[PDB]
Every structure is written in structure tokens, then in C-alpha cells.
Design a protein around this ligand. Structure first.
Ligand SMILES: [Mg+2]
Ligand SMILES: [Mg+2]
Lengths: 424, 435
């Protein structure tokens, strides 16, 4: 039985407070940190403008210590029964968007209990999650989708995809070597300041077009010697520059014209880009409620089309995207829905339509490495957890290296089959 | 006894390999990661890099990892040393290596084992690592929590522009608690990043290696003014002090005995003697609330340090001067060159030698500032080291990037854990060991 549940405030990778939760059982202390968090679950912030600019989480922490913690202990639920725990947490909150107790308060307890549940089983968390998710063996290690060039030019994320590598360990080496070439290249062509990094550890040179970013990544891949072995992925994050009033997308939404694209015109740009560069995945190509545009694009595209703001890890929105045939992959952010169990349901719903699933970090991350075990446990074959820079990003990649070494031949690298890794 | 010792390669915060060591005992698994060091230059302990230009640009650590797995591990298990006896463990490690600079087995291999064993020794005693280190170092209770020296703005070889000085830090020493000191620094940092974006363009918000901003700044006064304005916007003028790392070895011209404040391209007529550079520090310290200056003069310009020490009432911190090396500390005490040590455990290579360097500094009433490296990891050992040494000061980055925050979060956990049995060093950081 649970003996202690205690939460505290800690700092995420951008210097903002977030919730860390301790759950103590007979097996020891089990700890999880929640990452930073329009349709997603409601994160509770203090809103006191004199403290952390209003971004405190003292109220969410208090909800864990005074309400969730004492209620869950008294209920005495087996920590291995994750679905029962999360059902009780949502019953305790009682709101659809988790606005009573806070999505950050609920998720922190949900993830720390999951680690207590695995430990009572005597297995690593990824094995516990595979049990919960019903995913088959051997374990599959994910392809790291590495955001080495940070934007948002309009497009937000430019990722390298080392899918040809024979192992996860080698894919990381290739990505690390490409990133080092890219950083030198950015400094050479754009000045010393272009080597400084964005929130997720990629370089952010002052560049104008998508083709400029892709050319720089292409040259770095060639300098590293991996042309043809490393693919490219993008997160457009097009909701950032959609003007719903006129139904047009403003690629120059940073400078305050008639250069605004319809979704047919924007789709033309993606098709031109995908036919020139080895782009294998595009995330949020259209806005979070521009369902018509997504369905139009899905019909012609043979590459991965990832919902992020479209789906917000929400089984209800996933169902709509399946029915309208709007996308074929889910970006899975556990704190967009608020419990481990609903996150797993989101994954299973996607798998049922043969979607890919890409387990994802947030731009405000921590030293917590839960999503590495989630990606392996879900057999997703894909993870998005940053450039190989800043340790809130490397910590997840380091954790997968430990899992890889621990599993040996009982794990396979998803490689080029990342879109179908669950059935690999 | 130790049942297993095993090393692997992981990635540090700059994307380069480093050594992680596991030590397994009856209390469980005990793990440590080594920060980035130096494999060339022959200043600090010698880190072992693979040097294969086809792998990680030559920065692999497979050979160091192999040294732990095939040489150190088997030998240490067979030696059967009590894991709580850190001095005996580290004595054995240095005996195995046999070189003064740890270049046989690699300083990164040796320190990795040294730190993972230290955690195993703490767990055998049933106490957190900071308590074990307090025992090893002989520091008194209550525990003292360190003031964070936070490098929020960068210059020198890190950034463009003419700004020669390397690190500009905020020092929340007036705060009543460590938790409040972090909040203040976090709020000041957010103000500073907005100001840098406003005054220098959006690209100025992107961060350097340690999480600070690095816009194109020309002069030291320009940088200090930006920090001053951020402190005022956050409402903490007079409660937060300023510290600098000049890293003056980066622009010392040893053949001419002059410092080039425009070494990023420069007029040799504008080059400064150490007396002229000391004048600049004195002017800045009389205008701004600068309470600590690191490496004001070059790593072997002993005459300049001693000249500056004689007149200065603020903290003078050796980094390249002292390289956490007890021999160079003894020389600095004897010549009265500095009054504080930057303590980088991986510059000397064992926990025991690090603790000795701190005690040697304390014996001359020095301050001790436990320090990160440029290449850090998610490891938080130096947080426990700062508390266990009762140093009252830690330098572990801006409040940005989790290889920096992880240390700060760990001190938050220690603060909550200790309660009244800990006090925040506050304005007494220079003398916290005797607070
Ligand atoms: Mg996105
Ligand atoms: Mg220094």
C-alpha cells in the first residue's frame, strides 16, 4: 500500500516552475516530473503576477498534498492497476478538462504511481507499460526525431531522422555527428550567434525560407557522410500562422501582404518540398481545426502526416481525424490528456487505424525520462525529444541507451519501419 | 561487497559522449556521470578521449569505458574495500593508474568510479550523499545551502561582439532561503531574456552552453547595465549582487605581458598591462555591486593576482589559476594570489582529492565555489557536494537547460528534506564553512 504521496515545485528547462510528485511504497520512492503545458487538458497555474510572472504551481502542488494524496492512500488501490488509479484520479477531479485539480497535479500522481506499479512487479517501467498497452515482444526501440534546427522562417521544427542506422546506439551517434556539422555550418554561414540554441537545443539561425533550412541540414548530413541514410521531418506548427478569418496561411507572419496561401497553395509547397528533399513526416501541416485541409492533403500524400495541435492526444479528436481521414500519425503528449491510462488509450485508438505514434516531449522539459519508457512500452518506434543538445533532451536519449543495453537481443531498432513499428 | 561495476557511454549537454558508471551493492544500484573535461593542454587531470576522427569527431570515450569495465572494476571488486572508506577507495584508484595526471586509465574513468562508489558508501550508511560528504570533509552542522551564482549573460569566446569577459552572473544572496533565492534568479532571468530580445533582436533570446543569453555586446559596462536593468525590473535592486568570470587566459599575450580586451578582432596600443586591467576591475567594482571576480588575470600571471589581491575586498576566484589542484592552491596561498577556489571535481579526478583541495582552501579562509563544467549532464552530484562541503556557493548555470536546473532542483529537495537543520548561506557565502 501507498505510505506517502508528496509534491513539490521544481524548475523546467525554460526556468519555469512545474510539479514533481513522490509516491512511496514498500519498494521505495517513485518520482515523476510533469513537463510544461487550445484543446488540451487544463494545467493549473497560480496566476500571481508577482511570483514567477504568474507561472507558479503552488496550487497544483497543494492539490496533490492536501486532496489527491490523502484520498488515493485512503482508497487503497493496487499501484499495479493503473486504469483503476487513473479512474479514481479523474473521479476526484470530476471535470472533462481536469480544471478542478489541475492536469499537472493529476498527471504527476498518475506517472509516479505507474513507476510504483512497475517496481511492485519487479520490472522496468517500459515493461509495465507494454503490459498496460498490450504490445507484443520483442521490444522496439524508437527512431529519434531530432529537432536540430529550431524555427517559428515560419516552420517551427526541422528534424533529422536516422532510420537507416542498424541500432539505436548508432542512430544516436549519426545524429550527434550531423548536429555537430550543422552547428559549425550555422556559425560559418550566419555568424557566431547562430550557434546558440532554441528551447529544444537546435540551432536557430536567422533564415527566411524552408528551403534554406533544408539545404543547411542537407549539407550537414553530407559533411557527416550520411547522405541517403538520414531522412528529414518537419513540424510546421501551422496553427501559429493560420488566419481563420480569411482562411489563409501567412508564411511571413513575423513581419507586420498578398503573400498569404490558401490551403491548396500551402499543400503545393509541401508537395514541392517532399519531392525535392527526403521528407518522410510532416507535423501540423494545417491548422488545428482546418479539417478540410488535412483531409485534402491526406488523400495525395504517401508520407507520415502527424497530428499535434489537431489531435492533442485526445481520443475524441483522434476519432474525428480517423473518420474524416485527416492524418495518419499521432504526436503523443501525455500531459495533453493528463493520465497515463488515457494516453495509452489515445495510442491504441491510433494503432487501430494503423496510425503511427510518435511519443513527444514538450518545449518545457525536465530531467524526467518517463517518455523514454513510454515510447518503448508502446512499441511506437518513434520518439521526438529534441536535438542532441540540452540535457532535458539527452536524458531521454541516455535512458533509451540504458534500455538498449539492458535488453540486448530482446530489443530491435524500429529503423525504416517506424510508421508500423507496433506490428513489426 | 560490490557485486558489479559497469560503465557506458552517454551524451552530455553539448551532444558529446561522456562516461557513466554503475556500482552495485546490497543497497542497490549507484550511478554517476562525469562532466566534460580536457584531453589536451596539460593543465588539469587528463581525460581519456578515443581520438578516432570517424566517431563523434574524435570525442568518443569507449577506451575510458573499457578501462572501467576491464581494469578498474575487476581490480576494485577483488580489492574488497569498504565502500564507505572513500579515502581508501580513491587511494586504490590512483595506485591502479600510477600517473600524476591520471593519463593511464583516464581521469574520466577514475572519477566515474570514485563518485559512484561514494554514493554506494552513503547508501551503506543509510544517509544521503551530502551527509556522507560532510562526514568525509569534517564539516559541521547545521547544513548550509549554497548561494547560486547564475551565468545569465555570456561574452568572450562564447559570443560575438567585442565583449571580452566570459561570464556575467547574478548572486541572490539577500534572499531569506534557497527556495526564495532561486525564485528571484528565475524572475530576473526572464526579465533579462526579454530585454536582450528587445534591445538586440529576437535571436538574442537563444542561449549559450550554460543557458544564459549571448547577444553581440561591445563592452563590460554594456553587459552589466543590461543585468542591472533586469534586476530593477524584477524589483530586487540591492538584494541581488553581480559576479564575473573574466577568463582572462583567453586574451593574455604572454610574450608581451599584456591583455587584449578586443581579442575577437585589435589595436596593440589599446592592450592593457595587468595594472591597467586591474584599474578596469576596480572601476567596475566601485560602480556596480560586483562581489566576486573569477580569473581576473592569466593562469600563470602570479604577479598580477598578488598585486590585485592586496587591494581588493571582494572575492577573487581561481579557476584556470588553481585548476582544483592542491599543489597550485598551496602556491596561491603562499603568494597570496586569490581568496577563493572554483572546485571542479573532474579537474583533479577523485572525490577525496577534491575534498582535500577544499580543506586546503578553507585552511587559508578561502571561499569555495563548487562548479559545473561547460559540458554537463543530468547528474546532480555537485549539488550534494556543495551542501556536504558547507561551501555556501555553487556555480551551475543560468536557470535554463536542465543540466543546470537539475542541480538546483536537487538542492530544493535537500532544503525541504532538512528543514530547520539547514540554513541558507546568504551574504556570508565567503565564510559559509564557519557560519
Ligand atoms: Mg508541434
Ligand atoms: Mg572560469
Amino acid at each position: 500500500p501507498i505510505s506517502k504521496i508528496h509534491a513539490r515545485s521544481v524548475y523546467d528547462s525554460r526556468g519555469n516552475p512545474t510539479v514533481e510528485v513522490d509516491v512511496v511504497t514498500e519498494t521505495g520512492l517513485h518520482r515523476a516530473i510533469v513537463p510544461s503545458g487550445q484543446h488540451e487538458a487544463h494545467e493549473l497555474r497560480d496566476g500571481d503576477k508577482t511570483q514567477w510572472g504568474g507561472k507558479g504551481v503552488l496550487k497544483a502542488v497543494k492539490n496533490v498534498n492536501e486532496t489527491i494524496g490523502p484520498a488515493l492512500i485512503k482508497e487503497n488501490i493496487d499501484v499495479k492497476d493503473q486504469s483503476k488509479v487513473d479512474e479514481f484520479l479523474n473521479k476526484l477531479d470530476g471535470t472533462a478538462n481536469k480544471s478542478n485539480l489541475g492536469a499537472n497535479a493529476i498527471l504527476g500522481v498518475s506517472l509516479a504511481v505507474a513507476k510504483a506499479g512497475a517496481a511492485e512487479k519487479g520490472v522496468p517501467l517500459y515493461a509495465h507499460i507494454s503490459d498496460l498497452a498490450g504490445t507484443k515482444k520483442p521490444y522496439v526501440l524508437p527512431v529519434p526525431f531530432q529537432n536540430v534546427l529550431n524555427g517559428g522562417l515560419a516552420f517551427q521544427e526541422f528534424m533529422i531522422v536516422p532510420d537507416s542506422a542498424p541500432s539505436f546506439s548508432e542512430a544516436l551517434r549519426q545524429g550527434a555527428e550531423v548536429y555537430q556539422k550543422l552547428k559549425a555550418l550555422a556559425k560559418k554561414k550566419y555568424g557566431q550567434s547562430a550557434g546558440n540554441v532554441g528551447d529544444e537545443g537546435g540551432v536557430a539561425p536567422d533564415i527566411q525560407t524552408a528551403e534554406e533550412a533544408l539545404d543547411l541540414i542537407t549539407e550537414a548530413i553530407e559533411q557527416a557522410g550520411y547522405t541517403g541514410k538520414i531522412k528529414i521531418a518537419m513540424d510546421v506548427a501551422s496553427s501559429e500562422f493560420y488566419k481563420a478569418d480569411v482562411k489563409k496561411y501567412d508564411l511571413d507572419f513575423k513581419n507586420p501582404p498578398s503573400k498569404w496561401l490558401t490551403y491548396e497553395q500551402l499543400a503545393d509547397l509541401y508537395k514541392s518540398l517532399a519531392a525535392k528533399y527526403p521528407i518522410v513526416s510532416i507535423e501540423d501541416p494545417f491548422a488545428e481545426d482546418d479539417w478540410e485541409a488535412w483531409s485534402y492533403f491526406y488523400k495525395t500524400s504517401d508520407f507520415q502526416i502527424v497530428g499535434d495541435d489537431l489531435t492533442v492526444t485526445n481520443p475524441g479528436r483522434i476519432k474525428k481525424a480517423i473518420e474524416l481521414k485527416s492524418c495518419n500519425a499521432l504526436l503523443l503528449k501525455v500531459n495533453q490528456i493528463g493520465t497515463l491510462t488515457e494516453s495509452i488509450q489515445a495510442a491504441k485508438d491510433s494503432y487501430a487505424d494503423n496510425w503511427g505514434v510518435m511519443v513527444s516531449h514538450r518545449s518545457g522539459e525536465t530531467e524526467d525520462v518517463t517518455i523514454a519508457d513510454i515510447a518503448v512500452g508502446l512499441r511506437s518506434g518513434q520518439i521526438k525529444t529534441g536535438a542532441p543538445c540540452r540535457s532535458e533532451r539527452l536524458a531521454k536519449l541516455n535512458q533509451i541507451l540504458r534500455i538498449e543495453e539492458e535488453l540486448g537481443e530482446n530489443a530491435v531498432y524500429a529503423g525504416s519501419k517506424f510508421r508500423t513499428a507496433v506490428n513489426l
